[PDB]
Amino acid sequence: GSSGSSGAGSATITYSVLEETDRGSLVGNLAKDLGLSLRELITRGAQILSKGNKQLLQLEQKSGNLLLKEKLDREELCGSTNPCILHFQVLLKSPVQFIQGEIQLQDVNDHAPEFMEDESGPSSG
């Protein structure tokens, strides 16, 4: 059997946060993101990996919320530059595991219509 081939995409998670994010601001949910439980995140010790020395993130690991270390700067990360995405990774302990998350800039400006969803019905004849 054979059926062509294709598939790409490194980023697994994408967060939303401005650029002037204040220190101690909730970037997003990690344990709730993957839909995992704090415990699971705790057991596997889930932390934020940003930069070699001094991290710009700190997962309290209490409610699964990404906390900023300090007040960002600009150039340090991106500052204007595009796409302007933070570079981080979720570190896990035995079983040691790592993820390739991402931080998208708060580019909220669409909203779009939405209101619940539920559809399903086959057809044939």
From Swiss-Prot:
Disulfide bonds join C78-C84. Residues 17-115 form the Cadherin domain. It is found in: Cell membrane. Potential calcium-dependent cell-adhesion protein. May be involved in the establishment and maintenance of specific neuronal connections in the brain. This is Protocadherin beta-14. It comes from Mus musculus (Mouse). The gene is Pcdhb14. The chain holds residues 26 to 137 of 796 of the full protein.
